[PDB]
Amino acid sequence: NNKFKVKPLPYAYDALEPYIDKETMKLHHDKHYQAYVDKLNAALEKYPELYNYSLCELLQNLDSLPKDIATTVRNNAGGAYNHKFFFDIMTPEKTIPSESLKEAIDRDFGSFEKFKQEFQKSALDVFGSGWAWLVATKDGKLSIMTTPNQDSPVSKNLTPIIGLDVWEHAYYLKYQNRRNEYIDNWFNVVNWNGALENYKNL
Amino acid sequence: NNKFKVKPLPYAYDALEPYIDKETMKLHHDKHYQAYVDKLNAALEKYPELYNYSLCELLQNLDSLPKDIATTVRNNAGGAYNHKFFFDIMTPEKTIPSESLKEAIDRDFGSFEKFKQEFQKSALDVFGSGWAWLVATKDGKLSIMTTPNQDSPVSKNLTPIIGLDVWEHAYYLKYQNRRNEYIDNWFNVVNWNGALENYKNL
Ligand SMILES: [Mn+2]
Ligand SMILES: [Mn+2]
Protein backbone atom coordinates (compact mmCIF):
# COMPACT_ATOMS: atom_id res chain seq x y z
CA ASN A 1 0.00 0.00 0.00
CA ASN A 2 1.69 3.17 -1.28
CA LYS A 3 -1.12 5.62 -0.45
CA PHE A 4 -0.32 8.73 1.58
CA LYS A 5 -0.51 8.30 5.33
CA VAL A 6 -1.31 10.47 8.30
CA LYS A 7 1.79 10.76 10.47
CA PRO A 8 0.91 9.94 14.09
CA LEU A 9 1.17 12.90 16.44
CA PRO A 10 4.78 12.96 17.76
CA TYR A 11 3.72 13.58 21.40
CA ALA A 12 0.65 13.28 23.64
CA TYR A 13 -2.47 15.20 22.61
CA ASP A 14 -2.22 17.24 25.80
CA ALA A 15 1.54 17.78 25.56
CA LEU A 16 1.22 21.38 24.36
CA GLU A 17 -1.09 22.58 27.13
CA PRO A 18 -1.60 25.18 28.29
CA TYR A 19 -0.59 26.81 24.99
CA ILE A 20 -2.71 24.66 22.72
CA ASP A 21 -5.64 22.70 24.14
CA LYS A 22 -5.97 18.93 23.92
CA GLU A 23 -9.37 19.17 22.25
CA THR A 24 -7.92 21.23 19.40
CA MET A 25 -4.97 18.87 18.98
CA LYS A 26 -7.41 15.95 18.63
CA LEU A 27 -9.64 17.68 16.09
CA HIS A 28 -6.74 19.26 14.24
CA HIS A 29 -4.83 16.01 13.84
CA ASP A 30 -7.61 13.38 13.73
CA LYS A 31 -10.17 15.33 11.67
CA HIS A 32 -8.56 18.15 9.66
CA TYR A 33 -5.16 16.56 8.88
CA GLN A 34 -6.88 13.21 8.28
CA ALA A 35 -9.35 14.72 5.80
CA TYR A 36 -6.63 16.26 3.61
CA VAL A 37 -4.89 12.87 3.30
CA ASP A 38 -8.11 11.02 2.55
CA LYS A 39 -9.11 13.52 -0.14
CA LEU A 40 -5.64 13.49 -1.67
CA ASN A 41 -5.71 9.69 -1.88
CA ALA A 42 -9.19 9.67 -3.40
CA ALA A 43 -8.23 12.20 -6.07
CA LEU A 44 -5.18 10.13 -6.97
CA GLU A 45 -7.07 6.87 -7.57
CA LYS A 46 -7.51 7.94 -11.20
CA TYR A 47 -3.72 8.30 -11.62
CA PRO A 48 -2.22 5.67 -9.30
CA GLU A 49 1.34 6.36 -10.45
CA LEU A 50 1.17 9.66 -8.59
CA TYR A 51 1.19 7.70 -5.30
CA ASN A 52 4.90 7.27 -6.04
CA TYR A 53 5.52 11.01 -5.90
CA SER A 54 6.43 12.50 -2.54
CA LEU A 55 4.26 15.32 -1.19
CA CYS A 56 7.07 17.73 -2.16
CA GLU A 57 7.08 16.54 -5.76
CA LEU A 58 3.31 16.96 -6.06
CA LEU A 59 3.61 20.51 -4.68
CA GLN A 60 6.55 21.41 -6.94
CA ASN A 61 4.65 20.31 -10.02
CA LEU A 62 1.10 21.58 -9.54
CA ASP A 63 1.19 23.36 -12.89
CA SER A 64 2.12 20.20 -14.83
CA LEU A 65 -0.21 17.69 -13.18
CA PRO A 66 -3.25 16.58 -15.22
CA LYS A 67 -5.65 19.56 -15.31
CA ASP A 68 -8.54 17.66 -13.71
CA ILE A 69 -6.78 17.10 -10.35
CA ALA A 70 -4.37 20.02 -10.16
CA THR A 71 -6.51 22.11 -7.81
CA THR A 72 -7.54 19.21 -5.58
CA VAL A 73 -3.92 18.17 -5.21
CA ARG A 74 -2.83 21.72 -4.50
CA ASN A 75 -5.40 21.97 -1.70
CA ASN A 76 -5.08 18.51 -0.19
CA ALA A 77 -1.41 17.67 -0.70
CA GLY A 78 -0.93 21.18 0.65
CA GLY A 79 -3.02 20.37 3.70
CA ALA A 80 -1.26 17.03 4.14
CA TYR A 81 2.22 18.53 3.83
CA ASN A 82 1.55 21.64 5.93
CA HIS A 83 0.02 19.75 8.85
CA LYS A 84 2.67 17.02 8.98
CA PHE A 85 5.16 19.89 9.05
CA PHE A 86 3.24 21.87 11.66
CA PHE A 87 2.87 19.05 14.17
CA ASP A 88 6.60 18.24 13.79
CA ILE A 89 7.63 21.84 14.35
CA MET A 90 6.06 21.96 17.83
CA THR A 91 7.23 20.15 20.96
CA PRO A 92 6.65 19.89 24.73
CA GLU A 93 10.44 19.89 25.21
CA LYS A 94 12.22 23.17 25.85
CA THR A 95 14.34 24.23 22.86
CA ILE A 96 16.19 27.34 21.68
CA PRO A 97 17.80 28.58 18.46
CA SER A 98 21.37 27.27 17.99
CA GLU A 99 24.22 26.83 15.49
CA SER A 100 23.73 28.00 11.89
CA LEU A 101 20.02 28.82 12.26
CA LYS A 102 20.72 30.97 15.31
CA GLU A 103 23.39 32.83 13.34
CA ALA A 104 21.29 33.16 10.20
CA ILE A 105 18.47 34.70 12.20
CA ASP A 106 20.75 37.34 13.71
CA ARG A 107 22.28 37.95 10.28
CA ASP A 108 19.06 38.26 8.28
CA PHE A 109 16.83 39.98 10.88
CA GLY A 110 19.32 41.65 13.22
CA SER A 111 18.22 39.79 16.35
CA PHE A 112 15.95 36.99 17.45
CA GLU A 113 13.64 39.60 18.97
CA LYS A 114 13.30 41.52 15.71
CA PHE A 115 12.68 38.27 13.86
CA LYS A 116 9.93 37.34 16.34
CA GLN A 117 8.18 40.72 16.06
CA GLU A 118 8.13 40.53 12.27
CA PHE A 119 6.89 36.95 12.31
CA GLN A 120 4.09 37.71 14.78
CA LYS A 121 2.96 40.65 12.69
CA SER A 122 2.90 38.64 9.47
CA ALA A 123 0.91 35.92 11.23
CA LEU A 124 -1.51 38.48 12.67
CA ASP A 125 -2.11 40.14 9.30
CA VAL A 126 -3.03 37.01 7.36
CA PHE A 127 -6.53 37.75 6.11
CA GLY A 128 -8.79 34.72 5.88
CA SER A 129 -7.24 31.26 6.18
CA GLY A 130 -3.50 30.78 5.81
CA TRP A 131 -0.01 30.26 7.19
CA ALA A 132 2.97 32.34 8.29
CA TRP A 133 6.40 30.94 7.42
CA LEU A 134 10.07 31.39 8.12
CA VAL A 135 11.62 30.31 4.82
CA ALA A 136 15.07 29.83 3.28
CA THR A 137 16.32 30.23 -0.28
CA LYS A 138 18.61 27.47 -1.56
CA ASP A 139 21.65 29.46 -0.39
CA GLY A 140 20.29 29.74 3.16
CA LYS A 141 18.94 33.30 3.10
CA LEU A 142 16.04 33.74 5.54
CA SER A 143 12.81 35.66 5.17
CA ILE A 144 9.22 35.69 6.40
CA MET A 145 6.21 35.22 4.11
CA THR A 146 2.60 33.98 4.21
CA THR A 147 0.50 31.70 2.05
CA PRO A 148 -3.32 31.57 1.76
CA ASN A 149 -5.38 28.44 2.46
CA GLN A 150 -3.14 25.35 2.09
CA ASP A 151 -0.66 26.91 -0.36
CA SER A 152 2.99 26.17 0.44
CA PRO A 153 6.35 28.00 0.06
CA VAL A 154 7.57 24.70 -1.38
CA SER A 155 5.69 25.47 -4.61
CA LYS A 156 7.80 28.62 -4.90
CA ASN A 157 11.06 26.75 -4.29
CA LEU A 158 11.37 28.22 -0.80
CA THR A 159 12.22 25.91 2.11
CA PRO A 160 10.03 26.17 5.27
CA ILE A 161 12.02 26.39 8.50
CA ILE A 162 9.13 27.04 10.89
CA GLY A 163 5.46 27.76 10.08
CA LEU A 164 2.30 28.69 11.99
CA ASP A 165 -1.24 27.59 11.05
CA VAL A 166 -3.57 30.62 11.39
CA TRP A 167 -6.69 28.93 10.07
CA GLU A 168 -9.33 29.65 12.71
CA HIS A 169 -9.73 25.96 13.45
CA ALA A 170 -6.19 26.03 14.87
CA TYR A 171 -7.03 28.48 17.66
CA TYR A 172 -10.75 29.18 17.93
CA LEU A 173 -11.67 26.78 20.77
CA LYS A 174 -9.16 28.35 23.17
CA TYR A 175 -8.53 31.86 21.85
CA GLN A 176 -11.69 32.61 19.84
CA ASN A 177 -10.96 35.83 17.89
CA ARG A 178 -7.82 36.59 19.90
CA ARG A 179 -5.31 35.37 17.29
CA ASN A 180 -2.62 37.61 18.78
CA GLU A 181 -2.66 35.61 22.04
CA TYR A 182 -2.48 32.38 20.07
CA ILE A 183 0.49 33.62 18.08
CA ASP A 184 2.28 34.89 21.16
CA ASN A 185 1.77 31.66 23.12
CA TRP A 186 2.88 29.47 20.23
CA PHE A 187 6.47 30.54 20.58
CA ASN A 188 6.59 28.49 23.80
CA VAL A 189 6.16 25.27 21.81
CA VAL A 190 8.23 25.93 18.69
CA ASN A 191 10.71 23.11 18.15
CA TRP A 192 13.95 24.98 17.47
CA ASN A 193 15.91 21.75 17.10
CA GLY A 194 13.57 20.58 14.36
CA ALA A 195 13.90 24.01 12.81
CA LEU A 196 17.69 23.62 12.83
CA GLU A 197 17.33 20.26 11.07
CA ASN A 198 15.07 21.89 8.48
CA TYR A 199 17.69 24.55 7.85
CA LYS A 200 20.62 22.10 7.69
CA ASN A 201 18.78 19.95 5.14
CA LEU A 202 19.15 22.60 2.44
CA ASN B 1 -20.62 61.74 12.77
CA ASN B 2 -20.82 60.04 9.37
CA LYS B 3 -18.52 57.09 10.13
CA PHE B 4 -19.75 53.57 9.44
CA LYS B 5 -21.64 51.93 12.27
CA VAL B 6 -22.19 48.43 13.55
CA LYS B 7 -25.88 47.57 13.20
CA PRO B 8 -27.20 46.22 16.52
CA LEU B 9 -28.17 42.56 16.41
CA PRO B 10 -31.86 42.42 15.34
CA TYR B 11 -32.81 39.83 18.01
CA ALA B 12 -31.49 38.40 21.29
CA TYR B 13 -28.03 36.82 21.26
CA ASP B 14 -29.59 33.48 22.19
CA ALA B 15 -32.50 33.78 19.75
CA LEU B 16 -31.00 31.34 17.25
CA GLU B 17 -30.35 28.51 19.69
CA PRO B 18 -30.11 25.64 19.38
CA TYR B 19 -28.93 26.17 15.78
CA ILE B 20 -26.32 28.81 16.52
CA ASP B 21 -24.96 29.21 20.04
CA LYS B 22 -25.20 32.42 22.04
CA GLU B 23 -21.44 32.54 22.60
CA THR B 24 -20.79 32.54 18.85
CA MET B 25 -23.42 35.23 18.24
CA LYS B 26 -21.69 37.45 20.83
CA LEU B 27 -18.20 36.96 19.41
CA HIS B 28 -19.37 37.08 15.80
CA HIS B 29 -21.29 40.32 16.22
CA ASP B 30 -19.35 42.12 18.99
CA LYS B 31 -15.80 41.14 17.96
CA HIS B 32 -15.61 40.10 14.29
CA TYR B 33 -18.28 42.40 12.79
CA GLN B 34 -17.09 45.23 15.05
CA ALA B 35 -13.48 44.85 13.91
CA TYR B 36 -14.32 45.16 10.21
CA VAL B 37 -16.17 48.44 10.85
CA ASP B 38 -13.40 49.84 13.02
CA LYS B 39 -10.73 48.99 10.45
CA LEU B 40 -12.81 50.39 7.60
CA ASN B 41 -13.28 53.68 9.48
CA ALA B 42 -9.57 53.90 10.32
CA ALA B 43 -8.54 53.34 6.70
CA LEU B 44 -10.94 56.05 5.57
CA GLU B 45 -9.59 58.78 7.87
CA LYS B 46 -7.13 59.70 5.12
CA TYR B 47 -9.99 60.25 2.65
CA PRO B 48 -12.91 61.49 4.77
CA GLU B 49 -15.15 62.11 1.76
CA LEU B 50 -15.44 58.34 1.37
CA TYR B 51 -17.53 58.26 4.58
CA ASN B 52 -20.29 59.63 2.35
CA TYR B 53 -20.26 56.53 0.15
CA SER B 54 -22.55 53.68 1.14
CA LEU B 55 -21.00 50.26 1.72
CA CYS B 56 -22.42 49.22 -1.67
CA GLU B 57 -20.71 52.09 -3.47
CA LEU B 58 -17.35 51.27 -1.89
CA LEU B 59 -17.74 47.63 -2.98
CA GLN B 60 -18.85 48.54 -6.51
CA ASN B 61 -15.82 50.76 -6.99
CA LEU B 62 -12.90 48.85 -5.46
CA ASP B 63 -10.90 49.13 -8.67
CA SER B 64 -11.18 52.93 -8.81
CA LEU B 65 -10.53 53.79 -5.16
CA PRO B 66 -7.11 55.28 -4.33
CA LYS B 67 -4.57 52.43 -4.68
CA ASP B 68 -3.33 52.72 -1.09
CA ILE B 69 -6.66 51.72 0.52
CA ALA B 70 -8.28 49.58 -2.15
CA THR B 71 -7.41 46.25 -0.54
CA THR B 72 -8.20 47.34 3.01
CA VAL B 73 -11.59 48.62 1.88
CA ARG B 74 -12.29 45.45 -0.08
CA ASN B 75 -11.59 43.36 3.03
CA ASN B 76 -13.23 45.52 5.67
CA ALA B 77 -16.15 47.09 3.82
CA GLY B 78 -16.68 43.53 2.64
CA GLY B 79 -16.69 42.27 6.21
CA ALA B 80 -18.95 45.13 7.31
CA TYR B 81 -21.43 44.61 4.48
CA ASN B 82 -21.46 40.80 4.62
CA HIS B 83 -22.06 40.60 8.36
CA LYS B 84 -24.77 43.26 8.47
CA PHE B 85 -26.41 41.24 5.70
CA PHE B 86 -25.87 37.90 7.43
CA PHE B 87 -27.36 38.88 10.77
CA ASP B 88 -30.40 40.38 8.96
CA ILE B 89 -30.95 37.25 6.92
CA MET B 90 -31.46 35.07 10.01
CA THR B 91 -34.40 35.14 12.43
CA PRO B 92 -35.96 33.29 15.39
CA GLU B 93 -39.37 33.67 13.70
CA LYS B 94 -40.65 30.89 11.47
CA THR B 95 -40.65 31.91 7.80
CA ILE B 96 -41.04 30.24 4.40
CA PRO B 97 -40.47 31.15 0.75
CA SER B 98 -43.40 33.08 -0.76
CA GLU B 99 -44.52 35.23 -3.72
CA SER B 100 -42.02 36.05 -6.48
CA LEU B 101 -38.99 34.55 -4.69
CA LYS B 102 -40.83 31.28 -4.15
CA GLU B 103 -41.71 31.19 -7.85
CA ALA B 104 -38.24 32.21 -9.01
CA ILE B 105 -36.69 29.40 -6.98
CA ASP B 106 -38.96 26.79 -8.56
CA ARG B 107 -38.31 28.33 -11.98
CA ASP B 108 -34.52 28.58 -11.77
CA PHE B 109 -33.76 25.40 -9.75
CA GLY B 110 -36.79 23.20 -10.38
CA SER B 111 -37.84 22.94 -6.73
CA PHE B 112 -37.00 24.34 -3.33
CA GLU B 113 -35.46 20.97 -2.45
CA LYS B 114 -33.12 21.01 -5.45
CA PHE B 115 -32.16 24.59 -4.66
CA LYS B 116 -31.35 23.63 -1.07
CA GLN B 117 -29.19 20.65 -2.09
CA GLU B 118 -27.17 22.78 -4.50
CA PHE B 119 -26.75 25.55 -1.94
CA GLN B 120 -25.60 23.15 0.79
CA LYS B 121 -23.07 21.60 -1.54
CA SER B 122 -21.65 24.95 -2.61
CA ALA B 123 -21.38 25.98 1.04
CA LEU B 124 -19.70 22.69 1.95
CA ASP B 125 -17.14 22.96 -0.86
CA VAL B 126 -15.87 26.44 -0.02
CA PHE B 127 -12.17 25.88 0.61
CA GLY B 128 -10.67 28.17 3.23
CA SER B 129 -12.69 31.17 4.42
CA GLY B 130 -15.68 32.37 2.44
CA TRP B 131 -19.41 32.67 1.79
CA ALA B 132 -22.12 30.85 -0.15
CA TRP B 133 -24.75 33.04 -1.81
CA LEU B 134 -28.10 32.92 -3.53
CA VAL B 135 -27.82 35.80 -5.99
CA ALA B 136 -29.95 37.57 -8.59
CA THR B 137 -29.03 39.31 -11.85
CA LYS B 138 -30.71 42.66 -12.47
CA ASP B 139 -33.53 40.89 -14.34
CA GLY B 140 -34.24 38.58 -11.39
CA LYS B 141 -32.50 35.41 -12.58
CA LEU B 142 -31.30 33.28 -9.64
CA SER B 143 -28.10 31.33 -9.18
CA ILE B 144 -25.76 30.08 -6.47
CA MET B 145 -22.12 31.16 -6.16
CA THR B 146 -19.38 31.55 -3.53
CA THR B 147 -16.86 34.24 -2.67
CA PRO B 148 -13.56 33.86 -0.78
CA ASN B 149 -12.74 35.77 2.42
CA GLN B 150 -14.91 38.92 2.60
CA ASP B 151 -15.42 39.31 -1.16
CA SER B 152 -19.00 40.12 -2.18
CA PRO B 153 -21.29 39.35 -5.17
CA VAL B 154 -22.09 43.05 -5.05
CA SER B 155 -18.69 43.79 -6.62
CA LYS B 156 -19.77 41.66 -9.58
CA ASN B 157 -23.12 43.44 -9.92
CA LEU B 158 -24.98 40.44 -8.52
CA THR B 159 -27.61 40.99 -5.82
CA PRO B 160 -27.42 38.77 -2.69
CA ILE B 161 -30.75 37.22 -1.69
CA ILE B 162 -29.50 34.95 1.10
CA GLY B 163 -25.91 34.16 2.12
CA LEU B 164 -24.14 31.86 4.59
CA ASP B 165 -20.87 32.68 6.41
CA VAL B 166 -18.61 29.59 6.30
CA TRP B 167 -15.60 31.18 7.94
CA GLU B 168 -14.68 28.75 10.73
CA HIS B 169 -15.36 31.39 13.36
CA ALA B 170 -19.04 31.18 12.40
CA TYR B 171 -19.41 27.54 13.43
CA TYR B 172 -16.35 26.19 15.21
CA LEU B 173 -17.48 26.56 18.85
CA LYS B 174 -20.58 24.41 18.31
CA TYR B 175 -19.83 22.27 15.26
CA GLN B 176 -16.01 22.16 15.20
CA ASN B 177 -15.05 20.61 11.83
CA ARG B 178 -18.60 19.44 11.11
CA ARG B 179 -19.50 22.24 8.67
CA ASN B 180 -22.16 20.04 7.07
CA GLU B 181 -24.18 20.00 10.32
CA TYR B 182 -23.82 23.77 10.59
CA ILE B 183 -25.04 24.26 7.04
CA ASP B 184 -27.95 21.89 7.49
CA ASN B 185 -29.10 23.48 10.76
CA TRP B 186 -28.85 27.00 9.39
CA PHE B 187 -31.85 26.53 7.15
CA ASN B 188 -33.99 26.58 10.31
CA VAL B 189 -33.11 30.24 10.89
CA VAL B 190 -33.07 31.65 7.37
CA ASN B 191 -35.31 34.71 7.16
CA TRP B 192 -37.33 34.04 4.01
CA ASN B 193 -39.31 37.26 4.42
CA GLY B 194 -36.10 39.28 4.44
CA ALA B 195 -34.98 37.28 1.43
CA LEU B 196 -38.21 38.22 -0.36
CA GLU B 197 -37.55 41.88 0.41
CA ASN B 198 -34.02 41.51 -0.98
CA TYR B 199 -35.43 40.04 -4.17
CA LYS B 200 -38.18 42.66 -4.55
CA ASN B 201 -35.65 45.48 -4.16
CA LEU B 202 -34.09 44.74 -7.54
MN1 LIG C 1 -4.89 23.38 10.21
MN1 LIG D 1 -18.09 36.05 9.98
How would you describe what is shown here?
The structure is a homodimer of 202-residue chains. Chain A has 202 residues and is mainly alpha-helical. Chain A folds into two domains: 21-91, Helix Hairpins (Orthogonal Bundle); 92-202, Iron/manganese superoxide dismutase, C-terminal domain (minor pseudopilin epsh fold, 3-Layer(bab) Sandwich), CATH 3.55.40. Chain A is 47% helix and 10% strand. Chain A contains eight helices and three strands. Chain A has helices at residues 22-44, 55-60, 70-88, 99-109, 112-125, 172-175, 179-186, 192-200, and strands at residues 130-136, 142-148, 159-165. In chain A, strands 2-1-3 form a three-stranded antiparallel β-sheet, with helices on both faces. The longest helix of chain A has 23 residues, at 22-44. The radius of gyration of chain A is 17 Å and the shape is globular. At the A-B interface, helix 1 of A face helix 1 of B. The structure holds manganese (II) ion (MN) (2 copies). One manganese (II) ion (MN) is lined by residues 28, 32, 83, 165, 167, 169-170 of chain B. Chains A, B: Keywords: Capsid protein, Metal-binding, Oxidoreductase, Signal, Virion. Chains A, B: Its EC number is 1.15.1.1. Chains A, B: Mn(2+) binds at residues 28, 83, 165, 169. Chains A, B: It comes from Clostridioides difficile (strain 630). Chains A, B: It is an enzyme of class 1 (oxidoreductase).
